[PDB]
Scaffold this active site. Structure first.
Site, PDB file in Angstrom:
ATOM      1  N   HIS A 143      21.866   8.263  14.035  1.00  0.00           N
ATOM      2  CA  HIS A 143      21.640   9.271  15.073  1.00  0.00           C
ATOM      3  C   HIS A 143      20.340   9.039  15.831  1.00  0.00           C
ATOM      4  O   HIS A 143      19.302   9.569  15.430  1.00  0.00           O
ATOM      5  CB  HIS A 143      21.635  10.658  14.437  1.00  0.00           C
ATOM      6  CG  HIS A 143      21.542  11.783  15.429  1.00  0.00           C
ATOM      7  ND1 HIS A 143      20.357  12.155  16.023  1.00  0.00           N
ATOM      8  CD2 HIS A 143      22.480  12.628  15.916  1.00  0.00           C
ATOM      9  CE1 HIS A 143      20.567  13.189  16.818  1.00  0.00           C
ATOM     10  NE2 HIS A 143      21.845  13.493  16.777  1.00  0.00           N
TER      11      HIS A 143
ATOM     12  N   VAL B 166      16.405   9.683  16.091  1.00  0.00           N
ATOM     13  CA  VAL B 166      15.849  10.985  16.315  1.00  0.00           C
ATOM     14  C   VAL B 166      16.532  12.013  15.410  1.00  0.00           C
ATOM     15  O   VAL B 166      17.770  12.048  15.288  1.00  0.00           O
ATOM     16  CB  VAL B 166      15.985  11.377  17.809  1.00  0.00           C
ATOM     17  CG1 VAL B 166      17.437  11.356  18.255  1.00  0.00           C
ATOM     18  CG2 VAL B 166      15.405  12.744  18.067  1.00  0.00           C
TER      19      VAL B 166
ATOM     20  N   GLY C  77      18.879  17.803  16.411  1.00  0.00           N
ATOM     21  CA  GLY C  77      18.416  19.144  16.669  1.00  0.00           C
ATOM     22  C   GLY C  77      19.130  20.163  15.816  1.00  0.00           C
ATOM     23  O   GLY C  77      18.528  21.090  15.317  1.00  0.00           O
ATOM     24  N   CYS C  78      20.427  19.986  15.636  1.00  0.00           N
ATOM     25  CA  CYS C  78      21.213  20.942  14.884  1.00  0.00           C
ATOM     26  C   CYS C  78      20.682  21.139  13.457  1.00  0.00           C
ATOM     27  O   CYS C  78      20.888  22.197  12.873  1.00  0.00           O
ATOM     28  CB  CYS C  78      22.694  20.542  14.861  1.00  0.00           C
ATOM     29  SG  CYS C  78      23.078  19.063  13.904  1.00  0.00           S
TER      30      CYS C  78
ATOM     31  N   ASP D  29      19.297  24.284  11.630  1.00  0.00           N
ATOM     32  CA  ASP D  29      19.907  24.782  10.417  1.00  0.00           C
ATOM     33  C   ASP D  29      18.844  25.170   9.420  1.00  0.00           C
ATOM     34  O   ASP D  29      19.042  26.076   8.597  1.00  0.00           O
ATOM     35  CB  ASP D  29      20.852  23.771   9.804  1.00  0.00           C
ATOM     36  CG  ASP D  29      21.827  24.420   8.855  1.00  0.00           C
ATOM     37  OD1 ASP D  29      22.552  25.331   9.317  1.00  0.00           O
ATOM     38  OD2 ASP D  29      21.881  24.026   7.653  1.00  0.00           O
TER      39      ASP D  29
HETATM   40 CL1  LIG Z   1      27.161  11.122  23.838  1.00  0.00          CL
HETATM   41  C1  LIG Z   1      25.821  12.323  23.312  1.00  0.00           C
HETATM   42  C2  LIG Z   1      26.159  13.668  23.112  1.00  0.00           C
HETATM   43  C3  LIG Z   1      25.189  14.596  22.742  1.00  0.00           C
HETATM   44  C4  LIG Z   1      23.863  14.213  22.541  1.00  0.00           C
HETATM   45  C5  LIG Z   1      22.944  15.200  22.184  1.00  0.00           C
HETATM   46  N1  LIG Z   1      22.691  15.325  20.724  1.00  0.00           N
HETATM   47  C6  LIG Z   1      21.487  15.701  20.242  1.00  0.00           C
HETATM   48  N2  LIG Z   1      21.199  15.769  18.947  1.00  0.00           N
HETATM   49  N3  LIG Z   1      20.015  16.095  18.813  1.00  0.00           N
HETATM   50  C7  LIG Z   1      19.485  16.310  20.009  1.00  0.00           C
HETATM   51  C8  LIG Z   1      18.226  16.669  20.214  1.00  0.00           C
HETATM   52  C9  LIG Z   1      17.743  17.156  21.341  1.00  0.00           C
HETATM   53  C10 LIG Z   1      16.449  17.340  21.189  1.00  0.00           C
HETATM   54  C11 LIG Z   1      16.083  16.957  19.979  1.00  0.00           C
HETATM   55  O1  LIG Z   1      17.262  16.497  19.354  1.00  0.00           O
HETATM   56  N4  LIG Z   1      20.384  16.023  20.953  1.00  0.00           N
HETATM   57  C12 LIG Z   1      23.506  12.868  22.733  1.00  0.00           C
HETATM   58  C13 LIG Z   1      24.489  11.935  23.113  1.00  0.00           C
HETATM   59 CL1  LIG Z   2      19.912  30.362   0.694  1.00  0.00          CL
HETATM   60  C1  LIG Z   2      21.055  30.240   2.062  1.00  0.00           C
HETATM   61  C2  LIG Z   2      20.543  30.073   3.356  1.00  0.00           C
HETATM   62  C3  LIG Z   2      21.379  29.982   4.466  1.00  0.00           C
HETATM   63  C4  LIG Z   2      22.738  30.049   4.322  1.00  0.00           C
HETATM   64  C5  LIG Z   2      23.562  29.997   5.441  1.00  0.00           C
HETATM   65  N1  LIG Z   2      23.833  28.644   5.961  1.00  0.00           N
HETATM   66  C6  LIG Z   2      24.991  28.403   6.541  1.00  0.00           C
HETATM   67  N2  LIG Z   2      25.424  27.190   6.862  1.00  0.00           N
HETATM   68  N3  LIG Z   2      26.648  27.359   7.394  1.00  0.00           N
HETATM   69  C7  LIG Z   2      26.917  28.666   7.411  1.00  0.00           C
HETATM   70  C8  LIG Z   2      28.039  29.169   7.938  1.00  0.00           C
HETATM   71  C9  LIG Z   2      28.197  30.384   8.435  1.00  0.00           C
HETATM   72  C10 LIG Z   2      29.427  30.526   8.904  1.00  0.00           C
HETATM   73  C11 LIG Z   2      30.114  29.407   8.761  1.00  0.00           C
HETATM   74  O1  LIG Z   2      29.221  28.452   8.124  1.00  0.00           O
HETATM   75  N4  LIG Z   2      25.887  29.348   6.874  1.00  0.00           N
HETATM   76  C12 LIG Z   2      23.258  30.235   3.021  1.00  0.00           C
HETATM   77  C13 LIG Z   2      22.430  30.313   1.888  1.00  0.00           C
END
Ligand SMILES: Clc1ccc(CNc2n[nH]c(-c3ccco3)n2)cc1
Ligand SMILES: Clc1ccc(CNc2n[nH]c(-c3ccco3)n2)cc1
Lengths: 170, 168
Positions: B69, B75, B78-79, B83
Site C-alpha cells: 500500500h 504509505v 488512512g482507513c 480505525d
Molecule cells: Cl486507485 C487508488 C484509489 C484510492 C486511493 C486512496 N487510498 C488511500 N489510502 N490511504 C490514503 C491516504 C490518504 C492520506 C493518507 O492516506 N489514501 C489511492 C489509489
Molecule cells: Cl475494544 C473495541 C474497540 C473498537 C471496536 C469497534 N471496532 C470495529 N471495527 N469494525 C466494527 C464494525 C462496526 C460495524 C461493523 O464493523 N467495529 C470494538 C472493540
C-alpha cells in the site's frame, strides 16, 4: 473510459502501476485491496447523473482479517469496507485519464448499521459520483453504500479522493 | 477506570478477551490492531471535560501494510489510522465497565491532510470524549499525528457496545 468492467486481474495489474501507467493511480495490492471486481463503471448515469461504480468483494471465512478481528467474534472491519469505497473513487479518477497518485481526503457522514460475517457470500459496493474537480488539484466527491448479500449495511456521504502528481505536501 | 495507562501486552490481553472479560470489549489482534500503547486514559478532562485518551503506534519500514500500500509508494492506509480512533473509543467504553462487544457505528466529518511514511517514528492518537449514552455508546472527536504533526481529524466518532451482535 471505454472499458466498463474490470476483473481481479485488471485490478492486480492496476496495483502494479500497469493499468494506468507509472506515476498514476494504483490500487492497493493484497492484503489491503478490498475489491475483487468492478462490475460496472461509467461516467454517465448514477444517482447524480455524473457516473457510478458497482463492485464486489467475495467473502469466505479464511480472509485474513476474520481471525484477528475479533478473536471469538469474527467480523469484517468497518474501516476496510469504508476503504473499498475510497479505493473505487480513486480508481474512478485514474480511469478518467487523470494523472498522479491517489490520496483519500476524507468523508462526510459515515454510518455502519450492519456487519459482514465470515458466513456471508459477497459484499457489493455502490458508488455514486457527485462531482469531479479538474481545476488544479484533481479530486472527486461521491456517496457510497456497502451491502452484504442484498442487505445495505454502511453508508458514506461526501467521500473525497484526490490525485497528486507530487504528494510531497502530505 | 482505576488504571490510566496500558502497555502493548495489556492490549494483547484485551484482544484475547482477557482484560475486560468474556462477552465484553476486545481490541483486534494483529494485524488489525493499530495501537501499541495507551499512554493516558481518563474519564475527566479532555476537550469536553468528559474524558480523554492518548495512545501511540510505533512505525518502522517493515510494517506489513507498507509493502502492499502502495507498491513503489509506501504509505500507511488512512482507513487504519481512522480505525485506531474507533479502537480507542470502544476500549474506553469497556474500560468504564460497560458490558458487551464493540461495533463502530460511524463518524461525522473525517479529513486526511497528511500521511504516515515508512520513515516516520511514531503515530499518536488524541481522542476527546464528547458524550456517553447508557444501548451503550460513545461519541468522540479524534486526531492522528505523526512525529508531532497533526495529519487526520475525525468529528463524531461513534462506537457502541452490544450484549448481542446476532441481530446486527
Ligand atoms: Cl486507485 C487508488 C484509489 C484510492 C486511493 C486512496 N487510498 C488511500 N489510502 N490511504 C490514503 C491516504 C490518504 C492520506 C493518507 O492516506 N489514501 C489511492 C489509489
Ligand atoms: Cl475494544 C473495541 C474497540 C473498537 C471496536 C469497534 N471496532 C470495529 N471495527 N469494525 C466494527 C464494525 C462496526 C460495524 C461493523 O464493523 N467495529 C470494538 C472493540
Amino acid at each position: 473510459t471505454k472499458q466498463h468492467a474490470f476483473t481481479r486481474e485488471d485490478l492486480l495489474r492496476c496495483s502494479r502501476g500497469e493499468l494506468f501507467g507509472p506515476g498514476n493511480a494504483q490500487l492497493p495490492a493484497p492484503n489491503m485491496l478490498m475489491i475483487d471486481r468492478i462490475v460496472h463503471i461509467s461516467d454517465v448515469g448514477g444517482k447524480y447523473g455524473k457516473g457510478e461504480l458497482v463492485a464486489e468483494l467475495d467473502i469466505n471465512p479464511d480472509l485474513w482479517f476474520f481471525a484477528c478481528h475479533f478473536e471469538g467474534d469474527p467480523v469484517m472491519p468497518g474501516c476496510l469496507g469504508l476503504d473499498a469505497m475510497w479505493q473505487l473513487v480513486g480508481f474512478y479518477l485514474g480511469w478518467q485519464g487523470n494523472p498522479g497518485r491517489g490520496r483519500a481526503l476524507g468523508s462526510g457522514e459515515v454510518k455502519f448499521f450492519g456487519q459482514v460475517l465470515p458466513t456471508a457470500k459477497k459484499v457489493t459496493y455502490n458508488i455514486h459520483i457527485k462531482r469531479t474537480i479538474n481545476r488544479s488539484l484533481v479530486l472527486a466527491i461521491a456517496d457510497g453504500t456497502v451491502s452484504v448479500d442484498g442487505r445495505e449495511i454502511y453508508s458514506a456521504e461526501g467521500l473525497r479522493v484526490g490525485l497528486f502528481t507530487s504528494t510531497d505536501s502530505f
